[PDB]
Ligand binder design. Structure first.
Ligand SMILES: *[C@@H]1O[C@H](CO)[C@@H](O[C@@H]2O[C@H](CO)[C@@H](O)[C@H](O)[C@H]2NC(C)=O)[C@H](O)[C@H]1NC(C)=O
Ligand SMILES: *[C@@H]1O[C@H](CO)[C@@H](O[C@@H]2O[C@H](CO)[C@@H](O)[C@H](O)[C@H]2NC(C)=O)[C@H](O)[C@H]1NC(C)=O
Ligand SMILES: *[C@@H]1O[C@H](CO)[C@@H](O[C@@H]2O[C@H](CO)[C@@H](O)[C@H](O)[C@H]2NC(C)=O)[C@H](O)[C@H]1NC(C)=O
Ligand SMILES: *[C@@H]1O[C@H](CO)[C@@H](O[C@@H]2O[C@H](CO)[C@@H](O)[C@H](O)[C@H]2NC(C)=O)[C@H](O)[C@H]1NC(C)=O
Ligand SMILES: *[C@@H]1O[C@H](CO)[C@@H](O[C@@H]2O[C@H](CO)[C@@H](O)[C@H](O)[C@H]2NC(C)=O)[C@H](O)[C@H]1NC(C)=O
Ligand SMILES: *[C@@H]1O[C@H](CO)[C@@H](O)[C@H](O)[C@H]1NC(C)=O
Lengths: 597, 97
């Protein structure tokens, strides 16, 4: 009897059947990824289909234990993450239509071909193509073409499919007792009934719009600096009070300003620290890199690698014709089996990617004792916020000279710290308005505030107001510019990249205060310190066991995300920019336009 | 076994804990609900013996281990098993102990 006691013996058999089938699926997928052939695509979707039906039936069986009569927290959190219907609450033909739309939307993006108006025999794909034209080219009209042609070729097929995808997604989300599909997405940062750690779905919007009001004083000065620097690369094409043309920001959509570093480098001839000739003159390899990445975690107070990690991972490209899709990843196949798949070359970028990727294996090893349904980060933007602080610490010019890659007599000056901080700001603080504005447009368009005849109007109005860029070519209601992004045409949430950027610096300031650091925050190092490893391990080991607002409390001492550490990391750059824009005009006007002149 | 060695099983559900040095081999279907199921698996009626899926690419602590527990007792019989008595050389024509 005691319905709470039958759920315990149901989750007692699930936790084993699932743990046995998931390992099969994961190993079958690894065997394909590391080695592509004709049957390793068959016996991998075989295991995927055998693991999906199991879960789809175990949910039907778990629909029998009402979440009311349950009283424990772990069993409730496990049943609540297994009772979710998702799809298969729609009709059968409506689900078929939704799946067809979702599969037709991604192949218009994957196989998009933009043709040259002068030589339309051969055309260009996106990646080996427009993605490098928008990166390196310094011609105005060439970039204008590469932008408009892609937004008008793959921008007008996704519109009549996105119009229906919105409706079907809303109809699905309202059948799961949400109010729209935006609320379904925000229902990941939701905590209910913990008496002092609650977090409603309606508070994420408020918190995001409340933290974005303190980044504007820094984004405005960065915008003014980059505008005054771009006025010299394309003279007479930019107004000194207006916004920036939306096709000069360094890539296809303007998500990262990192390619603007060659034009807007603060101090002239002062190359920033790059240990890549020291590596090849000291004869490193793909083994020494990982052996040096592991000694860091062992010094900080964390375990070794499991010795099954060393003889099962694939960290080198297979020299022969053994084609493998290698994009650095950390696998967690289960049953204590951790592996890493990446094509390691002897560069400092791989030296930092190794630390990043092993920061995931450490997180995975931490919570490996939880039940099967509670092995994940506290929420969406935790598993990467944890990986990024390791690579933040491993690249300082003080950890490099104590590792044998930077001459001892090397002396750093502020004229290179400014360069490092500006190169960091173009990537970190350059994407926050873009992320916030995109996920605000999506929420508003899902809730029904933006009617279907005012999509591009509000899109470009917000692009001019919030992020401060203006379109070069007018766009009527036949376009869909947001759907020209990988995460929009492929149905992905896009707010984890906003919360991760704040969790990262919260964690860094919380940890590197326990290391008793003295100078600025962008010089912190957590090596040779166990008070930081033991403070991070007290959060790494929980998983989804406790609410994310309690996992945050353990490390940083606060119960929400804060933007003060992110502003305290860029204080030198802010002080430099502030008394460098005295002759410029901080801010922009939303009336200028590069076509109405 | 590469592919899984399911020959090894173990019991997962029992009504009441065992006794010291007791052994159960029952294969009756455990009942976690309030309705009988008449020896048929299904809802709230589980098969009590799950299997170990030993594969070689596991992690230490999930790999198989062979265990041998020994137990000594002296009930009432005034002789039985005991270890070896060592004997050294032997000299002659000397007063010895
Ligand atoms: C990559 O996959 C191919 C295709 O499955 C493998 O080719 C054969 O794999 C079987 C698997 O046991 C071997 O017994 C054969 O000797 C392989 N033949 C050849 C010509 O390769 C290939 O071995 C896989 N790569 C690796 C490193 O195992
Ligand atoms: C239900 O919640 C209780 C706590 O309220 C859990 O009790 C803990 O169980 C673990 C083993 O899983 C023990 O190591 C702890 O010592 C127990 N807590 C205390 C305070 O002793 C219980 O495990 C939960 N139910 C299930 C099925 O896990
Ligand atoms: C997941 O879907 C199932 C059915 O597909 C839901 O169970 C039914 O819910 C309806 C409406 O609440 C009831 O009228 C039925 O009696 C339920 N049982 C059936 C159809 O067997 C279930 O509630 C859904 N889960 C959640 C969390 O909403
Ligand atoms: C880096 O630090 C040096 C001193 O450590 C700075 O040089 C001085 O800067 C002030 C600022 O106006 C000047 O008044 C002084 O005249 C400078 N010193 C000399 C000897 O001329 C330098 O400005 C700093 N650079 C940055 C980018 O902050
Ligand atoms: C972390 O601690 C290790 C061990 O104390 C440091 O390595 C020592 O560094 C000093 C100074 O370069 C040498 O004289 C010792 O011989 C080193 N010992 C060993 C065992 O390597 C390391 O420099 C420390 N790193 C940081 C960043 O503080
Ligand atoms: C980690 O591995 C190294 C191998 O060089 C060994 O010396 C060290 O004792 C190990 N640490 C632990 C905690 O096992």
């Amino acid at each position: 009897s005691t319905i709470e006691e039958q759920a315990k013996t149901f989750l007692d058999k699930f936790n084993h059947e699932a743990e046995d089938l998931f390992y099969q699926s994961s190993l079958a997928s690894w065997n394909y990824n590391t080695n592509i052939t004709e049957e390793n695509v068959q016996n991998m979707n075989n295991a995927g289909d055998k693991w999906s039906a199991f879960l789809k039936e175990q949910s039907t069986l778990a629909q029998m234990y009402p979440l009311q009569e349950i009283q424990n927290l772990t069993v409730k959190l496990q049943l609540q993450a297994l009772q979710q219907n998702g799809s298969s609450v729609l009709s059968e033909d409506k689900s078929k239509r939704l799946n067809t739309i979702l599969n037709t939307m991604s192949t218009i993006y994957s196989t998009g071909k933009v043709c040259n108006p002068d030589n339309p025999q051969e055309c260009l794909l996106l990646e080996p193509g427009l993605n490098e034209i928008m990166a390196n080219s310094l011609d105005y009209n060439e970039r204008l073409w590469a932008w408009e042609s892609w937004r008008s070729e793959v921008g007008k097929q996704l519109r009549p499919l996105y119009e229906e995808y919105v409706v079907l997604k809303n109809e699905m989300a309202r059948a799961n007792h949400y109010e729209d599909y935006g609320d379904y997405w925000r229902g990941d940062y939701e905590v209910n009934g913990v008496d002092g750690y609650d977090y409603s779905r309606g508070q994420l919007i408020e918190d995001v719009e409340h933290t974005f009001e303190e980044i504007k004083p820094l984004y405005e000065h960065l915008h003014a600096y980059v505008r005054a620097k771009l006025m010299n690369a394309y003279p007479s094409y930019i107004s000194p009070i207006g916004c920036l043309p939306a096709h000069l920001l360094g890539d296809m959509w303007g998500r990262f300003w990192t390619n603007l570093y060659s034009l807007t480098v603060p101090f002239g001839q002062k190359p920033n620290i790059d240990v890549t000739d020291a590596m090849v003159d000291q004869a490193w390899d793909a083994q020494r890199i990982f052996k040096e990445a592991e000694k860091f975690f062992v010094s900080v107070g964390l375990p070794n690698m499991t010795q099954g990690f060393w003889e099962n991972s694939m960290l080198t490209d297979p020299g022969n014709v053994q084609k493998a899709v290698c994009h650095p990843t950390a696998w967690d196949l289960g049953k204590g089996d951790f592996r890493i798949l990446m094509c390691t070359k002897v560069t400092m970028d791989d030296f930092l990617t190794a630390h990043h990727e092993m920061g995931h294996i450490q997180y995975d090893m931490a919570y490996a004792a939880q039940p099967f349904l509670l092995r994940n980060g506290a929420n969406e933007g935790f598993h990467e916020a944890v990986g990024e602080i390791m690579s933040l610490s491993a690249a300082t010019p003080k950890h490099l000279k104590s590792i044998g890659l930077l001459s001892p007599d090397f002396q750093e000056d502020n004229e290179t710290e400014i360069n490092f901080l500006l190169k960091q700001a173009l990537t970190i603080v350059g994407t926050l308005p873009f992320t916030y504005m995109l996920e605000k447009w999506r929420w508003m368009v899902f809730k029904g505030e933006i009617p279907k005849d005012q999509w591009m109007k509000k899109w470009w109005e917000m692009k001019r107001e919030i992020v401060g860029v203006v379109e070069p070519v007018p766009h009527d209601e036949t376009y869909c510019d947001p759907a020209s992004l990988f995460h929009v045409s492929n149905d992905y949430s896009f707010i984890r990249y906003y919360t991760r950027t704040l969790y990262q610096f919260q964690f860094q300031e919380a940890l590197c205060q326990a290391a008793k650091h003295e100078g600025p925050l962008h010089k912190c190092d957590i090596s040779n310190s166990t008070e930081a490893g033991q403070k991070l391990f007290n959060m790494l080991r929980l998983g989804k066991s406790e609410p994310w607002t309690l996992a945050l409390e353990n490390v940083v001492g606060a119960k929400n995300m804060n933007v003060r550490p992110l502003l305290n990391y860029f204080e030198p750059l802010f002080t430099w920019l502030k008394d460098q824009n005295k002759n410029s005009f901080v801010g922009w006007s939303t009336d200028w336009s590069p076509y109405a002149d | 076994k590469v592919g899984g060695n399911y020959n090894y099983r173990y019991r997962l559900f029992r009504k009441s804990n065992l006794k010291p040095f007791e052994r159960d081999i029952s294969t009756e279907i455990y009942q976690a609900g309030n309705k009988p199921c008449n020896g048929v698996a299904g809802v709230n009626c589980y098969f009590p013996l799950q299997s170990y899926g030993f594969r070689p690419t596991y992690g230490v602590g999930h790999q198989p281990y062979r265990v041998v527990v020994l137990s000594f007792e002296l009930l009432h019989a005034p002789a039985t098993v005991c270890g070896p008595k060592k004997s050294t050389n032997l000299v002659k024509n000397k007063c010895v102990n």
